[PDB]
Amino acid sequence: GLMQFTLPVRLCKEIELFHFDIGPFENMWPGIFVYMVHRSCGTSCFELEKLCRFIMSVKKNYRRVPYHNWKHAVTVAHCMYAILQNNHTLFTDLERKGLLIACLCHDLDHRGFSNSYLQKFDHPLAALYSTSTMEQHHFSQTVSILQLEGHNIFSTLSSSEYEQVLEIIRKAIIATDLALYFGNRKQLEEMYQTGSLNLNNQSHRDRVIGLMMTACDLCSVTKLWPVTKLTANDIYAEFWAEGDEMKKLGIQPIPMMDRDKKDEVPQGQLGFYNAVAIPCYTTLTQILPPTEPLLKACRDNLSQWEKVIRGEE
Ligand SMILES: O=C(Nc1cc(-c2ccccn2)nn1CCO)c1nc(C2CC2)ccc1Nc1cncnc1
Ligand SMILES: [Mg+2]
Numbered sequence: 001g002l003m004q005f006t007l008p009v010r011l012c013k014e015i016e017l018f019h020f021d022i023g024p025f026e027n028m029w030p031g032i033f034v035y036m037v038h039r040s041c042g043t044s045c046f047e048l049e050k051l052c053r054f055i056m057s058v059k060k061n062y063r064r065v066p067y068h069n070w071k072h073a074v075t076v077a078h079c080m081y082a083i084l085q086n087n088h089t090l091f092t093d094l095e096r097k098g099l100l101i102a103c104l105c106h107d108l109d110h111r112g113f114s115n116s117y118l119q120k121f122d123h124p125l126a127a128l129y130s131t132s133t134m135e136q137h138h139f140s141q142t143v144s145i146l147q148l149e150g151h152n153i154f155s156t157l158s159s160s161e162y163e164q165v166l167e168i169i170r171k172a173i174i175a176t177d178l179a180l181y182f183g184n185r186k187q188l189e190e191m192y193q194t195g196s197l198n199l200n201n202q203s204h205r206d207r208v209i210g211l212m213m214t215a216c217d218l219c220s221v222t223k224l225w226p227v228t229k230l231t232a233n234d235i236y237a238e239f240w241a242e243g244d245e246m247k248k249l250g251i252q253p254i255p256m257m258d259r260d261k262k263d264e265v266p267q268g269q270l271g272f273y274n275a276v277a278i279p280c281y282t283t284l285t286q287i288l289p290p291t292e293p294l295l296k297a298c299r300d301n302l303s304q305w306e307k308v309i310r311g312e313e
């Protein structure tokens, strides 16, 4: 009860900033998460013993893939922490509980392959879940772990509160399907500009949490350039392996996934920043002004990719 988590000075200060990198010491990541839960939710939110057992079972169900791994889970959780801490009074008690857990669990049991590749492989999950295939699986894995003995971190919630939190988590995890992001942001853009955006309207809150989930999920493009540059290697390492597996099915992959077209990556990053990342953080900053540092960091990384093309690095 009186047992706080306390980080070294550099981490204690820098964890509050959006561009915080959780570092290469895997064994510090559970502690960093509990720290964030304690400050963002409270020391009373979860029974420490059940939370630690939950965290370690979640860790075990993330695979050793180059990008969609345990480090990504905790990285996405930290971006959500920074958003919640900079927007203190906008979110309910159940939302702060749900969203950190949603982020930690959002890529559970990811194999480093897109929904498209599962469909073309004819994977059993593509028959089980026709759209948002991996995201429905990630939610399924979250419920399974919550139901392990001693793992139910929501055990103190009423029946209706429990259903609400699991509904917040389901929608938040489904929203990480980038296919759903484009329409969600356009609707939030129209709602914001016509002045019809209303945070008392549950269907509006749902859309705003969806955009938050995309922002946290893409947050590797909001880090300092050396972090972003090296994380980009990890994501393309998955993309290129998926392209190899497309070639094994007799399908020429898209250039994004073709290791024979590495020269096209700088221009592919420009497209990604202009079409996905900058619009995301722009709409998020309009709705949640204190998230402006994510937009600034993203623009700085776009400028670095423009320098790579101009051969300045
Ligand atoms: O870069 C990403 N995507 C991309 C590459 C190309 C492309 C197109 C042509 C040629 C080369 N590349 N097009 N697109 C758009 C569709 O994903 C990317 N995607 C995702 C989520 C699966 C969507 C997450 C992070 C990403 N980047 C990243 C950069 N830095 C640090 N961490 C991550
Ligand atoms: Mg995902």
Ligand SMILES: [Zn+2]
Pocket (backbone or CB within 6 Å): 072, 076, 106, 107, 176, 217
């Ligand atoms: Zn993710």
